[PDB]
């Protein structure tokens, strides 16, 4: 259940902002001193990169990919990095069992040559967008207010922020999706043929 | 410093830090060497709230018709604690605990043999858990963890205002992974606009 | 009526939850030390289990069984494991009088070969769906919140908590029951046959 064992510039920007919500100054590399105040910002802004990936959004949805089993197991691994598996129609018939794909309606794990999904994959603080990536931040600048400096005055004002930037990140996909009533859907795309 | 560098942890151990972050305390590093109440407060709390998030609802959690099987020589079904509940296919469900042991409350008998098919909500680890969930399953036991210990008023008027996020979260997976139809899916109405 | 002097693992762990409920830190085992901190919290285990059981819920009605007379005596006894006995249409006759059932429309107390009731049986902390479980436990810890550890604000969150409880008990027996207007009742099950 991924680690933060790696550092990255573009994440180091973030850690910081985290570390300016409670008021405390940069850390200049996330290598690391004995702060839990550098260490658990760094962890909560993890805690929630797998929430704002865990919803929703458009493009973090692989539609139809093939997961494919070992050939001589022969069942396919369920990965902490896999946030959430659903099928391509209706009636999802996956779930984890051990750490493994496993049939609820078939009854059984082990079968051969493959699925089609819906896989949100998780991916880093980078790989995201920067409406997410303001987001992200903004709501670990919440939840880091909340759990050691909690500081009621100054949470007040970021709640109010970060509602800011969630409605800003609902604004972007909105036109990235492109999604149309009449033309776009599965119904009522074919009812309109002439 | 390296790269790629990929590595895993404990999603058991990851959510009793996120425990105990929310009482708003440094990590604890492990679970094991049975000392410090914080790492038995938070592992329990969080053991007695993930057999709550089964206990609901939830559709992938429900096994549709299974059979449980007596032995042949007693012959009854051993009824656990793992057992969250268990009902019945259809409806005016006939099964119920008695002594530990499944027991019918219309055929006033223990003793069947060859089997049933119910609905059994089986409970499951902290793993074995969409994210959705592992997220409502620490979330609230950051609550109930910050009621019985960490009592101040305000750090739980906004956690509680966040597993209520959550929970809605949630409660928009299985919307989509039940993928429920009206019209066309279940058992009154389907039946109807057959031409 | 009825005594708690044996013990159970599953039920340790609900008194585990109520010591919980104060802020106090678990109890090995019942057997038992001098502190009144886990014999109230036991007692008030016992004293609720009986409430929630006195109620309601479809799989503690038992729809009718028999209750069989000492053929000497002859008359039965109406322990305090029974909770409540009613009959089984209407306008029920039953009712204890010194221990022992008698009819208060046949001004008598010796029948013989029997009676047809709904007993409502005592059952343990076990027993019981997880539900309910729950729902013992979260409302056991609201009245051993209130007589010794009365902070308002902890109680003031577990009466949110025991509601939400009782919701989902609620939710239970909706679908144990599996009731239906128009097609399983007694009178307009008769009003749909052509």
Chains 1, 3 share one sequence.
Do not use: H
């Amino acid at each position: 259940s991924y680690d933060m064992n790696v550092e990255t510039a573009a994440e180091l920007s973030a850690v910081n902002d985290i570390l300016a919500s409670i008021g405390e100054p940069p850390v200049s590399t996330l290598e690391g001193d004995a702060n839990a105040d550098a260490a658990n910002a760094r962890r909560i802004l993890n805690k929630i990169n797998r929430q704002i990936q865990s919803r929703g959004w458009t493009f973090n949805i692989e539609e139809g990919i093939t997961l494919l089993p070992d050939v001589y197991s022969n069942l396919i691994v369920y990965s902490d990095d896999y946030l959430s598996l659903m099928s391509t129609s209706g009636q999802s018939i996956y779930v984890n069992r051990g750490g493994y794909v496993y049939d609820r309606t078939s009854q059984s794990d082990r079968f051969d040559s493959g699925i089609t999904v819906n896989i949100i994959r998780l991916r880093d603080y980078d790989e995201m967008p920067e409406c997410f990536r303001y987001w992200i931040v903004t709501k670990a600048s919440r939840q880091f207010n909340n759990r050691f400096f909690g500081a009621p005055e100054v949470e007040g004002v970021l709640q109010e922020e970060e509602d800011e930037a969630r409605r800003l990140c609902m604004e972007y996909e909105m036109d990235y999706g492109g999604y149309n009533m009449l033309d776009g859907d599965a119904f009522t795309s074919g009812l309109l043929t002439r």
